[PDB]
Scaffold this active site. Sequence first.
Site, mmCIF file in Angstrom:
data_model
loop_
_atom_site.group_PDB
_atom_site.id
_atom_site.type_symbol
_atom_site.label_atom_id
_atom_site.label_comp_id
_atom_site.label_asym_id
_atom_site.label_seq_id
_atom_site.Cartn_x
_atom_site.Cartn_y
_atom_site.Cartn_z
ATOM 1 N N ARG A 146 -15.580 -3.844 -15.294
ATOM 2 C CA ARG A 146 -14.365 -4.320 -15.937
ATOM 3 C C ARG A 146 -13.676 -3.154 -16.632
ATOM 4 O O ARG A 146 -14.291 -2.450 -17.439
ATOM 5 C CB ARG A 146 -14.663 -5.439 -16.938
ATOM 6 C CG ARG A 146 -13.504 -5.725 -17.885
ATOM 7 C CD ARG A 146 -13.740 -6.959 -18.747
ATOM 8 N NE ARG A 146 -12.526 -7.341 -19.459
ATOM 9 C CZ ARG A 146 -12.312 -7.127 -20.751
ATOM 10 N NH1 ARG A 146 -13.227 -6.560 -21.520
ATOM 11 N NH2 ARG A 146 -11.147 -7.484 -21.284
ATOM 12 N N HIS A 169 -4.830 -3.964 -22.400
ATOM 13 C CA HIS A 169 -5.894 -3.773 -23.376
ATOM 14 C C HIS A 169 -5.382 -2.964 -24.563
ATOM 15 O O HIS A 169 -5.960 -1.929 -24.913
ATOM 16 C CB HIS A 169 -7.099 -3.096 -22.727
ATOM 17 C CG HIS A 169 -8.398 -3.367 -23.420
ATOM 18 N ND1 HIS A 169 -9.493 -3.887 -22.765
ATOM 19 C CD2 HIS A 169 -8.785 -3.174 -24.703
ATOM 20 C CE1 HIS A 169 -10.496 -4.012 -23.615
ATOM 21 N NE2 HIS A 169 -10.093 -3.585 -24.799
ATOM 22 N N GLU A 195 -8.299 -9.830 -25.845
ATOM 23 C CA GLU A 195 -8.346 -10.147 -27.268
ATOM 24 C C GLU A 195 -6.968 -10.147 -27.922
ATOM 25 O O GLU A 195 -6.669 -9.254 -28.727
ATOM 26 C CB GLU A 195 -9.259 -9.157 -27.992
ATOM 27 C CG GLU A 195 -10.639 -9.040 -27.377
ATOM 28 C CD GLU A 195 -11.602 -8.259 -28.249
ATOM 29 O OE1 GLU A 195 -11.145 -7.625 -29.222
ATOM 30 O OE2 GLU A 195 -12.818 -8.288 -27.969
ATOM 31 N N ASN A 247 -14.774 -12.467 -25.047
ATOM 32 C CA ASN A 247 -15.569 -11.419 -25.672
ATOM 33 C C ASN A 247 -16.275 -12.013 -26.883
ATOM 34 O O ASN A 247 -15.620 -12.463 -27.830
ATOM 35 C CB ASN A 247 -14.689 -10.239 -26.076
ATOM 36 C CG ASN A 247 -13.923 -9.652 -24.904
ATOM 37 O OD1 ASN A 247 -14.217 -9.946 -23.746
ATOM 38 N ND2 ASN A 247 -12.948 -8.802 -25.200
ATOM 39 N N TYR A 286 -19.392 -11.323 -29.695
ATOM 40 C CA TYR A 286 -20.326 -10.385 -30.304
ATOM 41 C C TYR A 286 -21.242 -11.025 -31.333
ATOM 42 O O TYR A 286 -22.412 -10.645 -31.426
ATOM 43 C CB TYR A 286 -19.558 -9.224 -30.955
ATOM 44 C CG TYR A 286 -18.891 -8.309 -29.956
ATOM 45 C CD1 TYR A 286 -19.551 -7.194 -29.460
ATOM 46 C CD2 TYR A 286 -17.604 -8.568 -29.499
ATOM 47 C CE1 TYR A 286 -18.947 -6.356 -28.542
ATOM 48 C CE2 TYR A 286 -16.992 -7.736 -28.581
ATOM 49 C CZ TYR A 286 -17.668 -6.632 -28.106
ATOM 50 O OH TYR A 286 -17.066 -5.798 -27.192
ATOM 51 N N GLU A 337 -17.208 -9.204 -22.536
ATOM 52 C CA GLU A 337 -17.676 -8.185 -23.468
ATOM 53 C C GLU A 337 -18.818 -8.747 -24.297
ATOM 54 O O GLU A 337 -18.708 -9.848 -24.846
ATOM 55 C CB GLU A 337 -16.561 -7.705 -24.402
ATOM 56 C CG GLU A 337 -15.632 -6.664 -23.813
ATOM 57 C CD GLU A 337 -14.624 -6.153 -24.821
ATOM 58 O OE1 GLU A 337 -14.912 -6.212 -26.036
ATOM 59 O OE2 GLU A 337 -13.541 -5.698 -24.399
#
Length: 456
Positions: free
Chosen positions: A74, A118, A163, A300, A302, A357
């Site tokens: 990616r 991005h 994002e 994404n 985390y 991500e």
Amino acid sequence: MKFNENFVWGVATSSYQIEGAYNEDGRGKDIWGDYCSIPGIIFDNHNGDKACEHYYRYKEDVAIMKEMGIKAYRFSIAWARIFPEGIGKINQKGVDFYHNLIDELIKNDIVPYVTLFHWDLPLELAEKGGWLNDDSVEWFKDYAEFFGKEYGHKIKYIMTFNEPQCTIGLGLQQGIHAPGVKLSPKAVLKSTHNLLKAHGAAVKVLRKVAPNTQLGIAPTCGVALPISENKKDIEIARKRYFDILDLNDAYVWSVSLFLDPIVLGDYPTKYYELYKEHLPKITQEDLKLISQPLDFLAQNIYNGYRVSEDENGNYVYPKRKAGYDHTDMGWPITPSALYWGPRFICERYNLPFYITENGLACHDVVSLDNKVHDPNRIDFLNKYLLDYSRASCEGYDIRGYFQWSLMDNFEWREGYSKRFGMVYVDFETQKRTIKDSGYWYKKVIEENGENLLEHH
């Protein structure tokens, strides 16, 4: 087993963070290069002028991915490298580079997953108001249309935005990301709306110019986590996960703010009630343009946070235990986020789901044996993938997983003080060293996750 046979194992990068060659081969400026020119904004005044010099060393990076058996990569397209002015004249060397990079991935049996935007917004468009300008929808549309025309025949996966919570929220509401401003709620919501329209305009044109390319988007948020697995606590976490926040909070950090219009066809009701005096002009074509059907949804993820409620129905956030597992960002290590996150997203939007991500920063060093030992990363990824596997075994339509950064890169406001890659990068010599996690990940792909350790 642990994952399905079609599970796509991958790694992720972004253009500004790895490519370098910021003022070379006709590449126009972007908002982050401009942001970095403000002294004291970035850690030690780092910038992405050189980064990992991936623009010149992409062949080595593909070979490094081939050495780890990586089947999908990616990455993102520098909009200012193809359109140095955002719109108008194309930069042939920029188009040539992405042809060469894509062809190199195809030639090494690596499936490209492309992110159109991005964060590196061309500076010329930023000085025309950026997402505040209604023309931004046209700017991104033409940008997407060219990329589909030019590469659609060999790109099977395109996600529009990475994002938007960071681009809109940190960039325009909280002043934490480029351009670093804190604007009115009207400005932020108009910007939000223009980004969503730009997403829909891009999806629509990409179905004409790239009819065999699957389309999606990769937003982000913290995952609301239930304090227990009974019906009431799960509902609290679910409600919080898709809630619309008050204007005095960091309200752009909402899952539903972006994905309810895109997937369900309209903003949530709470959006219209709470933001009523700052709402942008919303037409049903706007909502019909934003709600273009997608092929997959990405996220994404985390970390997550425990959330409950008190006797008044107000959210309560319990403390984290003293000495809790954490990363070099100080972020918590919460593997259940890669279960509850995907679960909540699939139950609300019922779309094929990718983790685009997931990773952590570690204070990695080249030790005296010329190797980079990062067992903390391996444990992090192992624990997170176990909960991801839990979601797939329960029947949620999860299709793949991209571990964030293949290589250490420019971590935005932190500059190069934080290392997310499975490949260590000395930013002076540009020497690439595969970390222990990279060789471990190679076996994860080879065994499709039956190798992972347990007793979570």
